[PDB]
Amino acid sequence: SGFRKMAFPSGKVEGCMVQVTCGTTTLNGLWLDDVVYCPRHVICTSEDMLNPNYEDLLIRKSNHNFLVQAGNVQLRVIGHSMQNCVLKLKVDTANPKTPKYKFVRIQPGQTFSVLACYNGSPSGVYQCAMRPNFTIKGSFLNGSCGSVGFNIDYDCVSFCYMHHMELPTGVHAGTDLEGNFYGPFVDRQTAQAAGTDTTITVNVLAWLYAAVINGDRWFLNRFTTTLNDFNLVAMKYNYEPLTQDHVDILGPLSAQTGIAVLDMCASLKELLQNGMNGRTILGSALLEDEFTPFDVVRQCSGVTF
Amino acid sequence: SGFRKMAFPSGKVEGCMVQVTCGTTTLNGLWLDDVVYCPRHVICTSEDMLNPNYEDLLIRKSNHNFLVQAGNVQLRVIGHSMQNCVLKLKVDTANPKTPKYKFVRIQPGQTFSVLACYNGSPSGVYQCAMRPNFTIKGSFLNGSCGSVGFNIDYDCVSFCYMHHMELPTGVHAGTDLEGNFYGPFVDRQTAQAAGTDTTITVNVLAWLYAAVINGDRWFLNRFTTTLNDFNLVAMKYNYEPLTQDHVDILGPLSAQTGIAVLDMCASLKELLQNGMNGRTILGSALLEDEFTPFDVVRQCSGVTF
Ligand SMILES: *[C@@H](CC(=O)OCC)[C@H](C[C@@H]1CCNC1=O)NC(=O)[C@@H](CC(=O)[C@@H](NC(=O)c1cc(C)on1)C(C)C)Cc1ccc(F)cc1
Ligand SMILES: *[C@@H](CC(=O)OCC)[C@H](C[C@@H]1CCNC1=O)NC(=O)[C@@H](CC(=O)[C@@H](NC(=O)c1cc(C)on1)C(C)C)Cc1ccc(F)cc1
Secondary structure (H helix, E strand, O other): OOOOOOEOOOHHHHOOEEEEEEOOEEEEEEEEOOEEEEEHHHHOOOHHHOOOOHHHHHHHOOHHHEEEEEOOEEEOEEEEEEEOOEEEEEEOOOOOOOOOEEEOOOOOOOEEEEEEEEOOEEEEEEEEEOOOOOOEOOOOOOOOOOOEEEEEEOOEEEEEEEEEEEOOOOOEEEEOOOOOEOOOOOOOOOOOOOOOOOEOHHHHHHHHHHHHHOOOOOOOOOOOOOHHHHHHHHHHHOEOOOOHHHHHHOHHHHHHHOOOHHHHHHHHHHHHHHOOOOOOEOOEOOOOOOOOHHHHHHHOOOOOO | OOOOOOEOOOHHHHOOEEEEEEOOEEEEEEEEOOEEEEEHHHHOOOOOOOOOOHHHHHHHOOOOOEEEEEOOEEEOEEEEEEEOOEEEEEEOOOOOOOOOEEEOOOOOOOEEEEEEEEOOEEEEEEEEEOOOOOOEOOOOOOOOOOOEEEEEEOOEEEEEEEEEEEOOOOOEEEEOOOOOEOOOOOOOOOOOOOOOOOEOHHHHHHHHHHHHHOOOOOOOOOOOOOHHHHHHHHHHOOEOOOOHHHHHHOHHHHHHHOOOHHHHHHHHHHHHHHOOOOOOEOOEOOOOOOOOHHHHHHHHHOOOO
8 A cells, every 4th residue: 555656667768868068068868779869959059048040050060069978988979950949969879778669749637757867867756747837847957958758658668758948937848859848938048938837637536546545535525516516616726627538537446446536526626625624635735636547546556667 | 946756766776676486475576696685475375474483484495496587587596595584595697787785774764765666577666764663654565575775875776675564554664685674563464563653853854945945935934943942842743853963964954045953943843833824835735754854955956876
């Protein structure tokens, strides 16, 4: 029993992290087969942060202007292309540690693991969720760009995030591995507003099911409610609306417990309206929303990789 | 910016995880060089399970009764012995992925990363604290025994925990890698009482300092107090006493923020007396106590390994 914010094993991704340096700019890169992926910002010459001419700057920089270091092994760059906001460096050696991988674009509410890296070396791993406003609440410092986020689908490392920027609110923004930002952000020091953050309702319910599986049922009542009666309440507290698609995704946890989705919504409606009575749920005094229904099932089953 | 429950990179440990099988009983082992370490209770049956004479059970076992498998290759046990609650199986093959390692016994309040495994394969990684009552609040299912906990101290994987049992409260107990349990627990199904748990005061203060480093200052007050006055309040709220050694340990965070330790103690004193005002600190509505001062500096300064 027990339920923790659990990250994926980071070994497979650790073997892909390298240090990319261009001029004075140094950051992290992802080395898969003979291609190294990093944020294109590495070629900016400081002044370019505002209005970078990436077209003239890629033309400007030679292959020799890029240093790639896999630990203490220098990788020879033989090509440099740009895909949206990601710079792609072709190197003369294929990474033997390359795992079975895919590039995936995740949706808001889905979780992933982040391997925070600096100078091509790992510092730690933690779980994140793509917020409804396409930011992430991570832990990134200067030098952290190029760090990636990922899931492990069975035996395939699904890369879904590369880190680029930090907003003034202390949250973070980045791209998929094709260079396309999540949300309406651009890798430049310009004006950019993140929408209102909302609570990921489908995830809160999954977490309440996890609580029930692990023997926390004090929030359970005998009431029930309709899908639209619950959303009337949720929308007032910046909770994203619940749909039948979310109810279906919760079926597996509904089954394991015998508690219908709409009976748990009624219990959640109560917690949304009148707080938590100074009690806790799986060690928290707030409604946790960064656990997907899948995360709960795999945690309460022991799914290995 | 940002502060997350951050685990160490698990790569070095993933490469040491193997599957140990004695009869029908299968669990996880740690393969360092030419020896596999695992819980001795793999030799038991459920008949012996109760108050087993382990010395009599090992005697009855041979090397051939132990099947060890690293991924898809099988290792040959060429010797078996027992040190406290840990079973050492000398194997004919030495692990090439063995990191520079050390077996360490951690103090209460210290943290470590847990690599939850099943059938010799990792499932996830998360942070744990050795509670003052020598339990840990983990996430473990059947077949998780043998999973280990660790810190990375610069260039050395310091193994500090091997998982054994779940108590009726939902908490967990285990040993160091020398086979010696943390706390008064035994690897048997016999009466075992965990003491009344307490909050790790020094860690709460470190987490409040992390909040200040990350901009959350709403809880700071202009007051300071004595170490006895603070401890008078603390004892009432089930907080372990604060010692001068903990004050010194917090020096670097006080030194970095400009807030004296006893100044922060008065801020915590008022949070305990009057509550958190329905607010959150670093995304929690509770006072978090599973971040050591080092953990705070680790994540706030970008340590790598
Ligand atoms: C990553 C930069 C890096 O690793 O390169 C080292 C040479 C860095 C991440 C942030 C640093 C502080 N905490 C972070 O998460 N990104 C940057 O430095 C970019 C600039 C910023 O992100 C600033 N924030 C904004 O510009 C901003 C403002 C708004 C409204 O939205 N975004 C932070 C410094 C505060 C520039 C950069 C440099 C190199 C890259 F590879 C990508 C992006
Ligand atoms: C691990 C056993 C395993 O890996 O499978 C081998 C076939 C398992 C993990 C615990 C159960 C689930 N969560 C856990 O942490 N441990 C056990 O099965 C041990 C039995 C128990 O822990 C029981 N609890 C007690 O006996 C107990 C009683 C008191 C007063 O305090 N604790 C729970 C299952 C109810 C037995 C075991 C088996 C094999 C080992 F290598 C070590 C320990």
